[PDB]
Design a protein around this ligand. Sequence first.
Ligand SMILES: [Cl-]
Ligand SMILES: [Cl-]
Ligand SMILES: [Zn+2]
Ligand SMILES: [Zn+2]
Lengths: 30, 30, 30, 30, 30, 30, 21, 21, 21, 21, 21, 21
Amino acid sequence: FVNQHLCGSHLVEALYLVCGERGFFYTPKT
Amino acid sequence: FVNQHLCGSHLVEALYLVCGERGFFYTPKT
Amino acid sequence: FVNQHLCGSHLVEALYLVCGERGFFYTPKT
Amino acid sequence: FVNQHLCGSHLVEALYLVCGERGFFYTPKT
Amino acid sequence: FVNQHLCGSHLVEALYLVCGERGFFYTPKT
Amino acid sequence: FVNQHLCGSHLVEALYLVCGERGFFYTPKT
Amino acid sequence: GIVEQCCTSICSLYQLENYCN
Amino acid sequence: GIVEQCCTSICSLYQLENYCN
Amino acid sequence: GIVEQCCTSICSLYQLENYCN
Amino acid sequence: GIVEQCCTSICSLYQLENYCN
Amino acid sequence: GIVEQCCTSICSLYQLENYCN
Amino acid sequence: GIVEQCCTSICSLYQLENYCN
Ligand SMILES: [Cl-]
Ligand SMILES: [Cl-]
Ligand SMILES: [Zn+2]
Ligand SMILES: [Zn+2]
């Protein structure tokens, strides 16, 4: 895999692809 | 606003939209 | 809901989620 | 170009692509 | 059609819409 | 990581994610 | 409408342009 | 859970807020 | 307008809702 | 091909890497 | 190339079409 | 954190994987 530059919803899509059925938590600063 | 089917990455995108900086958890296993 | 920073197609996806079956119009400047 | 099924947010994303600055209407009720 | 300003995955989605069943190759620099 | 169904534009988005700067080919005809 | 044309059935990018302003 | 609420069945944006932190 | 506002500044879902048909 | 591997059936992210250049 | 052009400048669907298989 | 790192810098899929449940 390659490193990623992901902002906004692109990060959420990446988390979704990476975590699959496990799901994930999205926790921005502030 | 509406009620719709939101599945998969679209569901997490919607969560991103709705929650934003609060963050969110996507836990399909429950 | 949280405020949104949406550019490009992200705005269209947000409109789609917000308007559901009502649909929407997308009307950029110029 | 091709003919494909474009549904839901993918349909509006395609409209964004195709129309861009012209803007577009997405009116699923007709 | 309108000209496009597409970065990141937005370009890939545009390629997907444009090429349909033909598919496509995505070939960034470097 | 997980195994999931990845279809259509989501498949190419996943390829973008996974391949990035390597680039990739999406060739649905085989 | 557009959903019938492009989702239920299939449409080209030119048909999609029918729904531009 | 969320999938049952919003994908299998339908949910509003307010119900989606149930899954915010 | 909204397309610019949301991108150069911020906008709310409620402002967006004004653009539904 | 990729569609059979990853859409019709399921694939891992490593299998997706099979289609990188 | 196209990936850069579309992002740093603009590109057309027609230019994109060149990248189909 | 990760949300900032991936956007202002870069992050790996492996770093992301830490955020799965
Ligand atoms: Cl973006
Ligand atoms: Cl879908
Ligand atoms: Zn989809
Ligand atoms: Zn984007």
